[PDB]
A paper describes a structure:
Inteins are intervening polypeptide domains that conditionally catalyze their own excision from flanking exteins, rendering a functional host protein. DnaB, a hexameric helicase that denatures double-stranded DNA by ATP hydrolysis, is essential for DNA replication and thus for survival. In M. smegmatis, DnaBi1 lacks a homing endonuclease (HEN) domain and is located in the ATP-binding P-loop, and its sequence and insertion site are evolutionarily conserved in some mycobacteria, including M. leprae. DnaBi1 utilizes a noncanonical mechanism known as class 3 splicing where an internal cysteine (C118), rather than a cysteine or serine at the first position of the intein, performs the initial nucleophilic attack.
We therefore set out to solve the structure of DnaBi1 bound to zinc to understand the precise nature of DnaBi1 splicing inhibition. The DnaBi1-zinc complex crystallized in monoclinic space group P1 21 1. The asymmetric unit consisted of five zinc ions and three DnaBi1 molecules (referred to as A, B, and C). The zinc-bound structure of DnaBi1 is nearly identical to that of the apo DnaBi1 (root mean square [RMS] deviation of 0.065). Among the five zinc ions, one is bound at the molecular interface between molecule A and molecule B within the three DnaBi1 molecules in the asymmetric unit. Three other zinc ions bind to each DnaBi1 molecule in identical positions. These three zinc ions are coordinated by sulfur on C118, peptide backbone atoms (N and O) of V119, and the hydroxyl group (OH) of Y128 of each DnaBi1. Additionally, V119 and Y128 are found within a conserved splicing block of DnaBi1. Consistent with our SDR results obtained using our KD154 sensor in M. smegmatis, as well as our findings using the MIG reporter, zinc inhibition of DnaBi1 splicing was found to occur through direct binding to the initiating nucleophile for protein splicing.
Numbering used by the authors: 1 to 88, 101 to 139
């Protein structure tokens, strides 16, 4: 679901979607450690998107990656500029467009909101 070079914060610092392993820890919606309990392989040929955010950061995700918005969970293919990514000043999505397919990968974490922080801006996203 996210491009492999997407940086993700960790209790020790930073990793990437390409490097993070089951049993590692990411950061949950409150910034506390949250365990990775499942993943996907690296997946090829999925339709990819760039999501640009108001904090000056951007994340490449596939069409079906899920995002927590004020309207509820939306997949990337349904994001619209103006929406925000929230955990319950929320960062705003400023643009969404298709981009050529790159390798992507998803992970699942075990906090009750099923959210982890992603990108250099530490934006909330859904597993
Ligand atoms: Zn840092
Ligand atoms: Zn699509
Ligand atoms: Zn994921």
């Amino acid at each position: 679901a996210l491009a492999l070079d997407t940086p993700l914060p960790t209790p020790s610092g930073w990793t990437t979607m390409g490097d993070v392993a089951v049993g590692d820890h990411l950061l949950g919606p409150d910034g506390e450690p949250t365990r990775v309990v499942a993943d996907t392989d690296v997946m090829l040929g999925r339709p990819c998107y760039v999501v640009e955010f108001s904090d000056g950061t951007a994340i490449v995700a596939d069409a079906q990656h899920q995002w927590p918005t004020e309207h509820g969970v939306r997949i990337t293919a349904n994001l619209r500029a103006g929406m925000h990514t929230v955990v319950s000043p929320a960062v705003q999505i400023t643009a969404v467009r298709r981009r050529p397919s790159v390798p992507v990968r998803c992970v699942e974490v075990d906090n009750p909101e099923h959210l982890y922080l992603a990108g250099p801006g530490m934006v909330p996203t859904h597993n």
